[PDB]
Every structure is written in structure tokens, then in C-alpha cells.
Write a protein that binds this DNA or RNA. Sequence first.
DNA 1: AGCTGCCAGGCACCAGTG
DNA 2: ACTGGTGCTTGGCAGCT
Lengths: 788, 754
Amino acid sequence: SAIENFDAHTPMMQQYLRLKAQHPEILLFYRMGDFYALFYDDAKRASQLLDISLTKRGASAGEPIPMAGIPYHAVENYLAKLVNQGESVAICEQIGDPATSKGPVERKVVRIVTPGTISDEALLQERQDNLLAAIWQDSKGFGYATLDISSGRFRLSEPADRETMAAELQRTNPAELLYAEDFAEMSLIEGRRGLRRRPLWEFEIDTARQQLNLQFGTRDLVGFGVENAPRGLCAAGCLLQYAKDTQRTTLPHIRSITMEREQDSIIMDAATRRNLEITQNLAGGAENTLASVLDCTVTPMGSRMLKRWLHMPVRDTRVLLERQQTIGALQDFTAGLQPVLRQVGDLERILARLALRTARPRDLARMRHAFQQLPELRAQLETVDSAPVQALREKMGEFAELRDLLERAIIDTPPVLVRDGGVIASGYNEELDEWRALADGATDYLERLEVRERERTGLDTLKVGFNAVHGYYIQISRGQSHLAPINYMRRQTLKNAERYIIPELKEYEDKVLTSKGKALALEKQLYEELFDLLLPHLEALQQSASALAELDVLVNLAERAYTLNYTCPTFIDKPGIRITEGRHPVVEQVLNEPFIANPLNLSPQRRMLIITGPNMGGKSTYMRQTALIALMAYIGSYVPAQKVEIGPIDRIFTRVGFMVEMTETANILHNATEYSLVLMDEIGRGTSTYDGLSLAWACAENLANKIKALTLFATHYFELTQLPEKMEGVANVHLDALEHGDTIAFMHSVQDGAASKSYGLAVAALAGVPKEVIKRARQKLRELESIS
Amino acid sequence: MQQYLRLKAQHPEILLFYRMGDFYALFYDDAKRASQLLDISLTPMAGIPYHAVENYLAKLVNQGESVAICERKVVRIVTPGTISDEALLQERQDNLLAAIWQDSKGFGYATLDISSGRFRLSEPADRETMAAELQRTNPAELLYAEDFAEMSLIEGRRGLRRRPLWEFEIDTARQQLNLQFGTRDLVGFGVENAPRGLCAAGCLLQYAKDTQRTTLPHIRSITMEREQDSIIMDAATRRNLEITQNLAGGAENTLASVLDCTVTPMGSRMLKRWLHMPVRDTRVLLERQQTIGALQDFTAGLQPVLRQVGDLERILARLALRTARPRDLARMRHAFQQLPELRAQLETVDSAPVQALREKMGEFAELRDLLERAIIDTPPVLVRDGGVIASGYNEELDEWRALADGATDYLERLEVRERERTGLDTLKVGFNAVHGYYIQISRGQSHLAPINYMRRQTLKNAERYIIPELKEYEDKVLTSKGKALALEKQLYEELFDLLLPHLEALQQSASALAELDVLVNLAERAYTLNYTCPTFIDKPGIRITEGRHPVVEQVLNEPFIANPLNLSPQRRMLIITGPNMGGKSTYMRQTALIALMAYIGSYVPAQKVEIGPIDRIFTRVGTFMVEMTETANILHNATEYSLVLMDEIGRGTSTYDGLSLAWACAENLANKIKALTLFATHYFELTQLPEKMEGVANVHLDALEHGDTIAFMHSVQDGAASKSYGLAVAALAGVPKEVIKRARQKLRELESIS
DNA sequence: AGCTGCCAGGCACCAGTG
DNA sequence: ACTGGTGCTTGGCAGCT
Ligand SMILES: Nc1ncnc2c1ncn2[C@@H]1O[C@H](COP(=O)(O)OP(=O)(O)O)[C@@H](O)[C@H]1O
Ligand SMILES: [Mg+2]
């Protein structure tokens, strides 16, 4: 509680506070000898989070300074505890030599670990992307950018309204979200993880243009298709600024940025994504999703690509025909290709570490093991006549020169780190073999000296050993210690042994340690040199990884189509969906009865189906599976049906029934087009009897007669089956059921026309409502049916 | 590690921690399971470090897993329903062991709180009651029999423990229970002709004894809960009223978050029991009421003193099991010190019950004085290293400590002696496991060491030595300290011998202190929260004047609107129309909370409540299948003494189907069951019910259109609603104007037929 | 094969001679 | 201003049983 002016502090705390001032809201690991230290509330916080001791560094002038810390070699385990709780940590290191330093040794922050910029294998999940995003809002729209720092994939977009922006955050699921201080729609964003408020000036348009061109080495961003997009460039500017500030090295794997137009994909609202269960079931988990079914990729990078595709269907007809083509060609070849692709591993993330210069020995080894599969894949894919498959074979590369480089440079199975040597192999550098060979009197020399001195002295307890603190020694037991040569100079004393040193053992100590250190310092120069020779080829290597990943997805999708009995869909010119014996791709796996296949005929003249049928009749499944088939068709995949013809689809909307249901419904009515697939599931709620139904009725009318979209409209309201009569483009279908005394069977089959009756009382009876009460409700019911 | 597999065979159905240096190790399916539950990794290995073991045990026991520890041999086992250690328990949450079993007649159920020794027994008549007892009691560990049909009752539950059929034999269960209690028969606890419940209680106690391998002398009694003794609340109702736990599985915005301002964790747990088990016997209720009125003026004085009494109940458990640690005894002493101050404060209270608690609370001045002398002010966590017995308690101990201190003082002066005598300013005297005492000199000065010094250990920058003088006094220190430590331990075990004869009385005290905590709390809650004392009538009825929902009114900073209620046998059912938006559901839910609180003996949020007998409370308030299943249960089980609250049934099916069931339900509830009922509905067509039959009236909620919004009033008014608001809400949400115009047209067309 | 306690190394603090 | 001791976080492992 003293006045903590600059002069009141020790030279050390002056330096620590300037560094902390650059990172005021986040934890600062501050290298001091063998320990990262934290101070003040960082220490206190660290103590709770990491479960380490909160103590004090003593102080002559005033208050003791709260302190905690960890040994430098245990850091990665502590970084993991933090990043999993969404915490950033600024890592500070000693740059200077203490012996040539008057005051405190020079200290820089060299890195900042944040949830969205982590690239180490230990902190990531193999099969999930981990993205950094930036968001900003004008009075008019949103800018959004994402970056996979462990792949270079750098994207820009401009969502026009609240609900697309929501859909975009849902889809990309950023691990860390940078946002502007003036952001108005905080409902999209509060209660997200890795939330990071930024000042407005980081989203300035001129600085982003300048920094992105600098990064890409371009004059303008014309070539990238984003010069057009200031809204998005602003968020991209911030993102890149934050990415540079965390890593504090060059980032040469970020060579490109791509715009994501609304026209290029099918925009699925937030409800659609949740209700289709693409990678997340409605109960939060990852089981019984569409990905649980379709995803038997064999590489991490492949699984991450497949999930991105599921999530972003493409509209380019050419790309889709190329994908389908590939899938049909490789059908026979999946048993041969999968085991081999598996061995390539996560080459994508390894190349990120190569680019960041963080790549460990076992990354280089696994890169080598990937290069070694290329020829078998090249040979396996030659046979396959498919122009798209050959284009991937070509992009996949070979890198025989680099494969040999790593085969000669690094041993078969190196250790986890370079810190303690034993990575570079014999023959690679002859100066190293000479330095290493001097540090191999460890075998012969020391032992011949033991024997020799034991026999010369006659003292049978005499041994030669080493310890790190006192060095090489000759040990005699305490019983015999008094008979040792008077030449033996004393070095270390123990309870029951005395240890000594002689000029010849000292001479050997001095050469083994100065040559072990020189063998390490050359080995680390040589290993950092491996980066120099690999890095020039990084562009080709990244293209290669993406080719293998694509190959893995497409090989998987081919194998899926065979095993799960799927067909190739075709595309038509105008809106419409014709399905023959289609199935819910997920429900038909997780369900131990037969799945009843069902057709669907949707067109511009038959654009709205009023779906009826009893509760648990199959109404929602029918809708979901329609959308899932649409989705699977539009990633390029074969589809769970006897046959599918499908027209263009711009957006998919879903409403699954307070103020929220009506607002959602309004967004649909405002943004759906003749090309949209609209799924309304028992909407329309009011405070009285017909209140809610009248809204649903007017809504349907607007969808049918003014919007002309392709709507599926499940209802409990039998009154809506009068709609086809009155309204062009509308028709009735129902889910079939059979009554037969005290019971009801759900047939799960779509028929044309309205249900003959509604089965609410039958469902009530099934649920256990007393027979006497159902007797009375049927009586009442007939009174009502007699009105008309 | 063939040693691991054969120890795993010893207890194959239980997880097995297996010691390895710093860690406990789990292999095979043990590892799989444990990484799933604890957020740790695989290798099929899994490691849990030694310094944190108690923590990981507490999680696994919280999740229904027994654990075996192994140091080779299985030395210790923790089962979820039999722990009494403080680190393994949650202060304000009960933790029961339970046993269920089925007969060709009906169910048998028993529960034990192993800390308090509260032992219960029941004989649920059908499966629904049984399911309601399982939700209510939420046992940490459930014993069941091999021959058990109704597995859907207990399928999903944690802590399941399949047991042989012979473990439920009646004659063996009687003998064991009568041994446990010092009785020849069970007539005195009122359970001697309840054989099914006894069979469950026999298995539970066998199992409890087996987990402990100790007498359980604090289990001296068993009580039988009865159907008619309490207000039955099925699981759905219990969850809907948000008594201890909210709908999101939390502790906030719940009846306990407002009512439970108790000051000891033992009284908190007792209040939560009271809330989940409303009693019907108005005698007991009338006593709690009188007590809450009489204690009003004594609340501020009592609660600070009561607070200091602490969780005496659970400490007493560890006295019974002989695991109490020094701070248990200190906390227990600290609580004895409060008894005089509580006796004085309560003496003046005009209440027979408060005075009966005040006696039952006791004094224990001899035990207070014993622990004042025996133990120091703030003893360490463990007895293991001593420093727990205070000076003056034992003459032998004091003398051993004095010779220790003097041998220790001599070695301090030996340091100063040697240090001035040699002139070497770095000379000190350390102690060590390996070398005992030693003299240290720094490496720079170590060559000036006296010739009599004997090197034992070189360090990087010092040298340590013994002389025989060091060794001589070292002997005096370690022997004296060791005699003192053996004596502290024996004197500490002697405290258990002096306390335990008074255990029956101590348990009575803690139980009384807990009740008082609760009543003093409810008394302060009535005065602070403007509650009133409800009166009981002889026939079904609820008259509320200006009643409120006790949670909603403390939580939301919008003014709470109070409402009347008038249910009698001539006015059994209200049809409630108008917008919902939480207003209807709150009025229904506050009715149930007021009934519940009345039948806990608490005061209630109102100006006046009169209330007849209630046997059951049903609230269907929140698929169409789930709505109908809950409705079926109401219709099958409700009586003329029941309170039924229904939230717009008929939603999720056709208009005419949902209207037909609604009308049939209302009609059945009014003309057959005759239950007191609040029937919320959107069907305007149901407002004709009052014209067709006696006992039914219409009430409603309106809204108010103003400015650019709508204000949904929470005032219940006589008569039917004359307005719908679904289209106005659509308009406000931005549904295009032309669409609303059409819906307005369609709505008129639809209602005008009707 | 378990337990204890020195050590890793920057820095400030501190107390004994200039 | 200086020589030479001590203190401080956790994890590794030497030096004891
Ligand atoms: N075509 C089908 N074949 C077999 N089972 C089906 C089929 N469609 C639906 N089901 C099953 O019936 C259940 C009810 O489906 P659902 O679409 O939710 O009915 P609804 O929405 O009309 O109430 C689903 O859980 C699913 O398992
Ligand atoms: Mg449905």
C-alpha cells in the first residue's frame, strides 16, 4: 500500500513491470534462472489455477511481493492446464548472458499462448479445428475472419444480418474471438469462450490493407478477391495483428486469404445446424451425429476437412461433379489406399510447426514417414482413370530430395526434444561425429581407469563414477578410505564413502564436458538448419497435405457410399427435390429395426407439403432427412436413397416449435427465396384456441404464394389440411398409422393426401390416460366434428 | 505385475487404486472408466497423484463408485454411502445409503445417514410411491436384491449394488437389528410388524457394518415413515417446484436459496429434509408455528452463537467411529463453550418446545473443561506428529518436553560456542534424517575446521561434520521427543474413552442444536420476508389473500404482483385463461409453494392463508406424450384432498383432440376426483364449463398494450379472458404486416363458428 | 524401491569489513 | 561500494534405508 513509483522498485521489478504493462490483463511467466515466476495477483491467480504454492519474494523497502512459479522444464504441462480453462499466458525469456550484464539480464516476451493460436500437438485435439476469429459490426453489417494458425487457412466474410452472423459463429466455433469495443449485438457473443475485447483502432481499414499486403508480399489484394471487402478486411487486420503479436516470428504459412461469399455455399441458419446434428447432437455430445456415421477418415486432417464440408455445402456444380466422379472411381480402391494414407498422419499440423520453427524431432520423423508413403500412393492412384483423382496425385507431390535429407539427418526414432541431443545421426556432419567420439571415453576409458586404480592401490571397493554437482570421482569405501593414496585429492564426502580426484581424471572431465556441450551446440545449429532447407518448399508441402486430406475425405466418402448403400445424386435447373426410397442417414444406423424408406416430390408447382400424422408418426424425421440428403448432395457425396434428383438450394431454414419463435419465423419470411428449403415443425403459438393456428396459416400462405420456396410444414393442426384446396402450390401428405382396438401402430410411411383422422386421443390412451376419461373425450370430440 | 491382477480378483466389481511411488495406478477397464470420470489421461494406464488422493476419491464416490486402495494388500475401501470423512463429504448436502427390495405383496425400503445414524424404513404400496421415495431421498448408494423385477425404477441410478437374496431374510434381519439396538423386539421403534421394510434395513446394516469393520454405536434407533404422514410429491412435481434444485440441475433460484439462511451445515441439511417431506399432522405444525413466533425477538442474539456450534452432528460421527482428528475435538470444544450462552438466551422464550430443545441441548461442562485442558488452542490437522496435548494436562508429558527443550537449547548454545571459538562466522547446526544433527561450515571456511570434526557430507558449497558431543545430545532430543509423542497419542486415545460414554446425549444435543438452527432461521425468515401464520381448517380449502411466490419475489427486481385465491368444496376448480408468459404458471406454482410451506410449519408469503388437509400435490407445469403421461398419473392417483395444478394440456395435438381431453380432464377432476384444481388452459371453449357444472369458476390474466410494447399483467381477475395476444406478439417481433392482417382475418373466421 | 532433501539459477536481501 | 553467505517457487534423482 506504498507508493510504487519507478525508483521504489528493484532493477528486476522495474523490468518485470514494463513487460507486464505490455500484457496487463493476462498472466506473465517471467523467466528467472530455472523458473518462470509470476508476481502480485498473477501469482495469486496462478496459485488457484495451477495448484501451486503462493509465497513471497522478500523485500527491503516495504511490502513483500506475492509470488509463485514453476521449473522451466515443467512449463508445457502448466500451459495445458491454463489453455484448457481459456487463459492466455505471456511467456517471457532471458535473452542476455548474465556474466556480461551489469543490471538485470535483457528479457523479451517471445510468445503468448492463447486458446486460439496454439499449435503444439499437446494442446490441440486431433480431430477438431481450433480457430482464431475476429468480429466487428457496422451500422450496416458484420465483418468476420477466421484463422487456423496450425494450417494457414485464412478466411474473410461479410454476413449481412444478425442471424447469418449467428449461423457463422456456430459453424466456425472459434476458440478465441476478438471483437471491437463498440460491438452493438452483444447477444451473439457474450457467453462465448476466448472472448477478447479489442480497441477500435485495430480494425482500421488502412492499417489492415497495409499489414495484409505486407504479410502476402502483394501491392493490393486484388488477386485474392478481397480488395472489394473493407468490412471483412477490418476484422482480418485485427486477427493478423493479434496472430503476429502472439507468435512474434514470421508466419510464412499464411500466404493467402479467401473470401466466403453467401452465393458460394448453402447458408444454413442456427436452428438447421442444431436440428440436423452435423457434428453435435442436441444434448451437447458428438455421438449419433451425421459425422459419427460418415466419418471414418484415417488422418486427423482428413477428419477436420470432412467436418468443414459437412458444415459448408458448395453450390459450384463443377466442383460437385468432380467430387462425385472421384468417389465413384475410388470405390474399388479404398481397402488398399486407407492403410497407406493413415501412415501419412497429420502432416498439416506438422507443417505449421515447421513454419513456426517449433517442430520437434518426432515431427520431422513423422514428416519423413509421410514422404515414404508417397510412392505407394502414387503407384496405387496411377491405375485409377479419373482426371480429378490424377490432379490430386500430382498435387500430393513426392519430395524424394527432402525424404533423403531427413533419412540421413535424423535417427530412426529420436527423442521428444532436441534439448538433450541424440537427434542428428552418424554420417550427417563429420565435425559432429568427431565431437561425439571424444564424449565416448564414457564406455572404455573410465572403466580401464577403475580396474587399473583398483589393482594399483589394492583397494577392492574403489569405483569410478560421476555426479552432476561434483563431477567425476574415484570412490573408496570409508573402511578403506584411510589407505588411499596421499596423491588422491579430496572432492566429496559421504556417510560411508570418500570420493577423490586426480589430475588425469580432471583432465578427462574437462574434455568430456567441453566436448559434450560443443556437440550439443552444433547439433542444435544443424537441426535449426533442417528448417532452412525444408522451408523454401513449404508452399508445395502445404498443397501436398491438403491433397492428402482431400484424398482421405473422398476415399472415405467412397467407402461410405459402398458400405451404407448410397447413390449418386443428379442436379436439375430449377428448384425441386425428387427422392426415391430415401432414409435418415443417422437414424438408420442407430435403431435396431428396419428403416422405412420414403419418397419426396417437391417442385415449383408442388412447393409446399403440409405434413400430418400422429405424434411419433415420423414427421420430424422425414423433414430432417430431406435436409440431410440436400446437404450430402451438396458436399459432393453419394446419398442415402435409391435415387435423388435435386435442384439448386440457396439457404436452408428451420423453425422447431415466446417472442423468439415469432422473431425466428419473421427472419424466414424476410430472407427465404424461390431457392430456399424451409422446414417448419409444428410452429404457431398463441394464448387462445385459434390464435396460434391463424398465424401458422397466414405464414404458410406467405411461404406458398409470395415467397414460393420449397417448404415442408409439419403440423398438429388438422385445420391446415384445408390449405391445398385454397392455395396454389400446396398439397397434403401424412404419416400413416393403423388403429385396431386398444392400440396404435406407427408405420413411418409417407402417403399423399391428408390423414383421414387425427390420433391425439389414441396417443393419450397409449400414454395411460384412464379409459373413462378417453370415453368422455371421444363423446366431446364427436360434438365438435358435427359442427361441420 | 501379476500381483496387480490377483488383488483385482479380490474385489473385481470395484475400482482398484494401486500404489506406485508418488501415484495410485489403475489398469484395464479401471483406467478406461477413471479417465472418463476424472478428466485424466491413458497411456492402459491412469495415474492419480498421492497428494490429491482424497480429492479424486470424493469425485468417484460422488459419482457412485466404490474405490479400493492398495499399499501388497487392499488396506482401505470407500463406498459412496458409507463415508464419514470431512474431505469426502459436501457440507450442506445429505449422503445416504439405501436398500430396496420387492415382495409378492409390495416394496421394502430403508435409508441410513451413516454420520447422524438416522435410520429409516418404509413400505411403499405401489411403484409410483417407490419412485417418489427414490427421487426424494437420492441415495448415494443403492443395495438391491437378485430377484428384483422392477429394474426400471433403479436402472439409471448411480451406486447400484447387486445383493444375494439370503441377505434379505426376515429372521436374520430381526436378530441383527435387535442386537444393534440393545432390544429384544422392535415394538419400541414402531416397526415390528413391517417385515418388508425390515428385510431392507437388515441388508443395509449388514452392508454398513461390513464397509466399516467397526461397531456403529451411533445407530441406536430406526423410524418408519408412513404414507399418510406426509404430502406425497411425485418426481415430476418435486422437480417442477424447484425445492432444492432448479430445472437446470442447480442450487440457485430455488425454494432453499431463499428459505435456507441457517448457520450450521447440520441445520441446513435438516431444513432441506423438512422441505422435501411436508408433514400432515397439524399438531407438529402448530408447534413449529408457535416456536417461530416465540423466537422472533431472539433471532439476532441466537444466530451468531449458533453459527459457532458448527457441524457437530458429523464430528460426533467421527467420535463414534474413532476417526475424529484434533480439530474435530477443538471444534467440538468450541461448540460446548456456546451452550451456556444459548441456555441463557433461550431461558426467557415463552415456548414449551423451545424449552424442551434447551434441555435436550445440554451443557457438558465436564467435557468442555476436559478438552480445554487436554488440547491446545489451535491443534494441527493430524495427531501423527504431536503438538496437540496442552502443557499442564499431564505431568509425564511436560517433563519429557522439558528435557527435549533443554537438550535442544544446549545444541543452540553449542553452535554459538563452536562459532565464537573457531572464529568461523558460517558455522551452524542443522538436523537431518540421514545424519541427525551436524555442524555445517561453508566451503570457503571448511579448511579451517577443527581436527576433531568428522566429515560426513560434502555439499556444493559447504561441509557437514559430527563430533561425539553432537551425537550425545541428539540422543537426548530424539528419545525425549519420542516418549512425548507416544504419550500424546495415548492421552489422545484416552480422550475418546472419556467422551464416548456421553455419546447418546451428545447426539441428542447436536440434533436439538440443528432443529433450533432451523426454527430460528424460519423465524427470522418470516419476520424479514413479511410472512404470516397460516391457519388450518378441517375440510379441503385454500383461502389466500395477497399471496406471493417466495422465490420469484426475492429474485426479480420488477414489483411482484400479489393475488388472492379461493378454493373450497363449493369452488373446487378454476379455469385460468389469458396469456401465459409465466404469469399463470407462477400463480399455480405459488399456490403449491404456499401449501408446502404451510405444511412444513413455516410462515408463508401472504396477508392471510387458511388451508385444509392436503394428501398430495401434483404440478404438471412446464413431447405431448410426456404431458399426457404426467396427466394420466394425476387422474389415476388424485383424491378430494389433492392439489392439482395443470398448465394448458392439449398443446401438441389437434385442436379438437386437445380440447376434448382438456374438457374430459377438467370434468373428471371436478366431478369425480373433486380435487382442488387450478386448470390453466388456452381453450376459450372451456370457459363454458362453469355454466354446465357446480364447483367451477372462470378466472384470467390480461395484458396492456401501450407505447411500442405489451405489458403482461400478473393480476388474476374473475371471468374469462376476452382477448388473445399471439398476433400482437407476432407484430412486435416483425412478422410482416400483411401476414398479420391475414391471420386476423383467419382468426375471426375460426372463432366465430364457435 | 520408498523417502528426504540438495539442487537447478537468476535475483534481491543481508550482515560483515572498506 | 564489496565478498559471501541466505531465500525462493517444483520436479528430478542421489543418497540414504
Ligand atoms: N422412416 C422411419 N423408419 C423407421 N423409424 C422411423 C422412421 N421415421 C421416424 N422413425 C422413428 O420414429 C420416431 C418418431 O419420429 P418423429 O419424426 O420424431 O415423429 P414426430 O416428429 O411426428 O412426432 C423417431 O425417433 C424414429 O426413431
Ligand atoms: Mg416432430
